[PDB]
A and B are shown apart, each in its own frame.
Chain A
Amino acid sequence: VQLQESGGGLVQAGGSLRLSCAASGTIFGPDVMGWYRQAPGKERELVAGISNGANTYYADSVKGRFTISRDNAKNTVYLQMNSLKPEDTAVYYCAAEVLDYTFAYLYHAYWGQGTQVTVSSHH
């Protein structure tokens, strides 16, 4: 499968931002979509996750601020954040998991290129 990001860029503190990750596969593409973030000098961590509908999960530090959605017309995932905080400066990746129904231990994880997002307190 092929994964592409869009919407990265700098934004002032307390603003809003959107990222869109598009996947290209053979059958339904990804099964579980997610966003991971990696701060400099800090290992990657899972910011948000989704499978379909209202079956979402958000990291405990970003609950009530971030939101995630999926679209089947173009088979993409949209991440919206509002009221940015200056510790959110990180490189963001969209992760796609294809898991087999017959035996749950097998799974395939695909990582995209990622985009750099910097939060500045002042303009």
Chain B
Amino acid sequence: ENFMDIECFMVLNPSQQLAIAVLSLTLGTFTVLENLLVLCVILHSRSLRCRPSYHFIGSLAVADLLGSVIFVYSFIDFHVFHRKDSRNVFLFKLGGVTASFTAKVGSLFLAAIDRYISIHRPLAYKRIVTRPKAVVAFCLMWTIAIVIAVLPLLGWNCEKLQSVCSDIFPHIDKTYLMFWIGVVSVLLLFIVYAYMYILWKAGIDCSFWNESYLTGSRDERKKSLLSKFGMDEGVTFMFIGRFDRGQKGVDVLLKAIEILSSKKEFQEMRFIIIGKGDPELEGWARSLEEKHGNVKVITEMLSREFVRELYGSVDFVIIPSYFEPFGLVALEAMCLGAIPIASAVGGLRDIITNETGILVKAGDPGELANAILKALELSRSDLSKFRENCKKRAMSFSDQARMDIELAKTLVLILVVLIICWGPLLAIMVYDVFGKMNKLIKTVFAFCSMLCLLNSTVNPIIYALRSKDLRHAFRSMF
């Protein structure tokens, strides 16, 4: 009938009320001051507030406030001021606590959705989620948490229904408690599954284009690949893409091969062309394959691993693209130590610098011819420096994904500490709604009910341990 009455649940030795009270005061004030510190840091910094991906932290901090103040005020409303609690204020406090927990769960939900978008769909993260979509989503999350918190005040209490009534908390019924615990539990299960799937899929997909998956040296790999195609050892060139006119300049490559066919150095060259598309270009490539004995054309669909090996074996990769927005082929080539010879247009203009690879103008077979000749000239010397520089640059463009994975790991840590802190309490609520309700379980509930405040204590501690940008903003504040 009274909120936060320790003597109701367990008999406490009268020698340590002062110690319990002062510990509760220190913990509550520490939580409140550190949460306001987190809000001040996250709001006074332009860099963090302009990033939607960190928004959840603020939301969590707000939730960390909502469960904290309602704690300490309820200590003031009972101990130092001996006023009793009516039905309305008790339901208000219970709604505040439940709103804090539901807001934490929903913030983790929006954070998981954002993590999936940012990690596994990187080409859409910039343009799907922005300021208005994220702020609207967080607003609806907070409002739905608020309304499920407020539902018992509208007439879903134990008094009005006159039904079977809960024992662990008065003035509420079993049906509302079951509904709230069910939606929270199914949400948390979905979060666990989603974060496990995100961390599993991104583990193999991100670290896939590394040279650690290839066995043997580059020279013997190239020799084995060329012997598989029935060709002699030489400087190898690779093209992989789409057989069409306008998107990828494969016709430019074929014209360049025809131009080099008139020279004496063509017999040293080896050419591999992989693609599928217009039958005219396919027939043209087949005619060049039948004419010269150092040109191989592959049309059937290739697996990912096979193409990984091909990048690992060839010496140069030709990308004569007319319009290449993202330059993914260059990134995959340089991740596996292949020098790219690409047209200076689109992303290929700024992925490849003048030192890493060779850049030509778009649509000129002559410039491509001179570039291939210069590549063969450079192949006389050692190309290990080019390989290492291309690998370094390609790994440099992948730095965003690793930070996204680190943020996902921080979110997983937040979720698991939430689960650890709210496990026994949720299980005790399950035991209350389903089955009997004895005094020992009441004492266990009273003991583990401090884990919510401990959870609110430890949530902003790990932000400093994980978020470097939050530390930078805090240092800039001082």
Is A114 close to B, CB under 8 A? no
> Which residues of A lie under 8 Å from residue B325 when comparing CB positions?
32, 49, 51, 55
Q: How far is the CA of A122 from the CA of B130 in the complex (A)?
A: 48
Interface residues of A in 19-66 (CB under 8 A from B): 27-28, 31-32, 36, 43, 45-46, 49, 51-52, 55, 57, 59-60
Q: List 27 A-B contacts (CB under 8 A).
A: A27-B121, A27-B128, A28-B123, A28-B127, A28-B128, A31-B123, A32-B325, A45-B245, A45-B246, A46-B322, A46-B323, A49-B247, A49-B325, A52-B127, A55-B347, A57-B345, A57-B346, A59-B246, A99-B123, A99-B326, A101-B122, A102-B205, A102-B208, A104-B328, A105-B274, A105-B302, A107-B242
Known pairs A72-B127, A101-B121; A49 contacts B241 (CB<8 A): no
Known pairs A27-B121, A52-B127; A99 contacts B328 (CB<8 A): yes
Minimum C-beta distance from B394 to chain A (A): 13
> Which residues of B lie under 8 Å from residue A31 when comparing CB positions?
123-124
* A→B interface (CB under 8 Å): 27-28, 31-32, 36, 43, 45-46, 49, 51-52, 55, 57, 59-60, 72, 99, 101-105, 107
Q: Which of B122, B124, B208, B302 has the most CB of A within 10 A?
A: B124
> Which residues of B lie under 8 Å from residue A107 when comparing CB positions?
242
Which residue of B is nearest A102, CB measured?
A: B205
Contact B205 A57 (CB under 8 A): no
> Which residues of B lie under 8 Å from residue A43 when comparing CB positions?
245
Cβ contacts B106-142/A at 8 Å (1 or 0 each): 0000000000000011111011100000000000000
Q: How far is the CA of A46 from the CA of B345 in the complex (A)?
A: 16
Q: How far is the CA of A52 from the CA of B125 in the complex (A)?
A: 12
Q: How far is the CA of A32 from the CA of B242 in the complex (A)?
A: 15
Number of interface residues of B (CB under 8 A): 31
Is B363 close to A, CB under 8 A? yes
Contact A105 B127 (CB under 8 A): no
Interface residues of B in 325-371 (CB under 8 A from A): 325-326, 328-329, 332, 345-347, 363
> Which residues of B lie under 8 Å from residue A32 when comparing CB positions?
325
Contact A57 B127 (CB under 8 A): no
Known pairs A55-B346, A57-B345, A101-B328; A49 contacts B323 (CB<8 A): yes
What would 11 more interface pairs be, CB under 8 Å, given A59-B246, A101-B123, A102-B208? A31-B123, A46-B246, A49-B247, A52-B126, A52-B127, A57-B323, A57-B345, A102-B304, A104-B326, A104-B332, A105-B274
Q: How far is the CA of A80 from the CA of B218 in the complex (A)?
A: 50
Minimum C-beta distance from A98 to chain B (A): 9
Which residue of B is nearest A58, CB measured?
A: B323
